Design an enzyme around this catalytic site. Structure first.
Site, PDB file in Angstrom:
ATOM      1  N   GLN A 186       0.803  -1.239   0.000  1.00 29.25           N
ATOM      2  CA  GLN A 186       0.000   0.000   0.000  1.00 29.25           C
ATOM      3  C   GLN A 186       0.820   1.266   0.000  1.00 29.25           C
ATOM      4  OE1 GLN A 186      -2.925  -0.315   3.065  1.00 29.25           O
ATOM      5  NE2 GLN A 186      -3.697  -2.146   2.254  1.00 29.25           N
TER       6      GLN A 186
ATOM      7  N   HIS B 122       0.146   5.519   0.965  1.00 25.96           N
ATOM      8  CA  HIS B 122      -0.757   6.556   1.430  1.00 25.96           C
ATOM      9  C   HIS B 122      -0.388   7.852   0.777  1.00 25.96           C
ATOM     10  CE1 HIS B 122      -0.568   4.044   5.322  1.00 25.96           C
ATOM     11  NE2 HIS B 122      -1.446   3.532   4.476  1.00 25.96           N
TER      12      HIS B 122
ATOM     13  N   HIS C 116       4.574   0.082   1.315  1.00 21.65           N
ATOM     14  CA  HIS C 116       4.810  -0.734   2.476  1.00 21.65           C
ATOM     15  C   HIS C 116       3.835  -1.884   2.485  1.00 21.65           C
ATOM     16  CE1 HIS C 116       1.646   2.101   3.782  1.00 21.65           C
ATOM     17  NE2 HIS C 116       1.237   1.132   4.569  1.00 21.65           N
TER      18      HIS C 116
ATOM     19  N   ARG D 233      -3.133   0.760  -3.965  1.00 28.79           N
ATOM     20  CA  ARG D 233      -2.459  -0.524  -3.953  1.00 28.79           C
ATOM     21  C   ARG D 233      -1.302  -0.555  -4.908  1.00 28.79           C
ATOM     22  NH1 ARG D 233      -6.469  -1.913  -6.035  1.00 28.79           N
ATOM     23  NH2 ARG D 233      -8.276  -1.255  -4.751  1.00 28.79           N
TER      24      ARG D 233
END
EC number: 5.3.1.8
Length: 392
Positions: free
Chosen positions: A98, A100, A256, A275
């Protein structure tokens, strides 16, 4: 009423362990469900509950009715709700890589998805907040993860044995810089058909000729994701095993993944996720590349360095949304106090909390909500208590 023992939701996601919460904390699972996440907070879908009168009420509902009293004025004015969600995560299989998005790009994605009219609850909803929504993870058992790009020459050394897997790999090796690292990341994710199988064959072959890490992590991943381009990701991204008690903050624009083990996680009721592999879902690769910083992070800088003051071990977090501390218990009471709402979770041993006349025991895996108005409480016992709160 002063200190409130929490009743908490367990999310039975298919990736959860059927045993971990039971082995660690004695949580009943006679139906042998996968037990993926234990939630501590006031998420509107699944708020923790507290006991009244005999009855239970949603913690979210209780906070909503007495915001300033329960949250504190700082948090009430700053956030208008409980600003963190606290979880036990039990990854029995590796989860997806993932990223962010940062603040600016979260604003745009949130706005773009709202303008397109996509429900907040839809599976295509990547952006649920216009702010960057950071995460902290703290290992309760050894915790295998990936986090951030490795140093360029570490990536060079790791890709040589698979140099033949894809021209984008050879291209990076020729000039191992950010631009070509970005190009490599995208090219791997975009591999299709025989290009993808050819690359994965080269990688498998390498699993037999190379020993140790991160090859071993790739092997572990491949059991669950045999046909995923993300099998290459441990050659680009740092692989870390956190020992119990170590922690790591997950920065924006940084790939991560949680791969194995049990950990505490602090985040928010809202999250933004792009993703980046180990998923059978659709990846918008251009958008992903646009939200990743292709900058190495030295392995020495991955863990959060805590600060010990008396019995308190603080894990400094570079945002105001939440703070996290570990408290070593002793048979003589110690005062634990804060200006915000707090949640206290018994990590190990046993904790006896006291406010005035009220006494409350937490065994490992149990938690209590302390309203801002009820700070401080006295803690004694053995082992350690984790606290989530706000330093504001």
């Amino acid at each position: 009423a002063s200190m409130q023992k929490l009743i908490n939701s367990v999310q039975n996601y298919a990736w959860g362990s059927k045993t971990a919460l039971t082995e660690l904390y004695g949580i009943a699972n006679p139906q042998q469900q996968p037990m993926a996440e234990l939630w501590m907070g006031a998420h509107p879908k699944s708020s923790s509950r507290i006991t009244t009168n005999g009855e239970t009420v949603s913690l979210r509902d209780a906070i909503e009715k007495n915001k300033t009293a329960m949250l504190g004025e700082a948090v009430a004015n700053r956030f208008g709700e409980l600003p963190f969600l606290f979880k036990v995560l039990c990854a029995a299989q590796p989860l997806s890589i993932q990223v962010h998005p940062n603040k600016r790009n979260s604003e745009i994605g949130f706005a773009k998805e709202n303008a397109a009219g996509i429900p907040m609850d839809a599976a295509e909803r990547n952006y649920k907040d216009p702010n960057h929504k950071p995460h902290l993870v703290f290992a309760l058992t050894p915790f295998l993860a990936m986090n951030a790009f490795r140093e360029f020459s570490d990536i060079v050394s790791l890709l040589q044995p698979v140099a033949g897997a894809h021209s984008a790999i050879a291209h990076f090796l020729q000039v191992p810089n950010a631009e070509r690292l970005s190009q490599l990341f995208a090219s791997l994710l975009n591999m299709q058909g025989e290009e993808k199988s050819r690359a994965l064959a080269v990688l498998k072959a390498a699993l037999n000729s190379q020993q140790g890490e991160p090859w071993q992590t790739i092997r572990v991943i491949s059991e669950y994701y045999p046909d995923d381009s993300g099998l290459f990701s441990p050659l680009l991204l740092n692989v870390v095993k956190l020992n119990p008690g170590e922690a790591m903050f997950l920065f924006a624009e940084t790939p991560h993944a949680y791969l194995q083990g049990v950990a505490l996680e602090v985040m928010a009721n809202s999250d933004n996720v792009l993703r980046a592999g180990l998923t059978p879902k659709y990846i918008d690769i251009p958008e992903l590349v646009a939200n990743v910083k292709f900058e190495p992070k030295p392995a020495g800088e991955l863990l959060t360095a805590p600060v010990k003051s008396g019995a308190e071990l603080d894990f400094p977090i570079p945002v105001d949304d939440f703070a996290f501390s570990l408290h070593d218990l002793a048979l003589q009471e110690t005062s634990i106090g804060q200006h915000s709402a707090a949640i206290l979770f018994c990590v190990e041993g046993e904790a006896v909390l006291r406010k005035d006349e009220q006494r409350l025991v937490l065994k490992p895996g149990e938690s209590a909500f302390i309203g801002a108005d009820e700070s401080p409480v006295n803690a004694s016992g053995t082992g350690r208590l984790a606290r989530v709160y706000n330093k504001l």
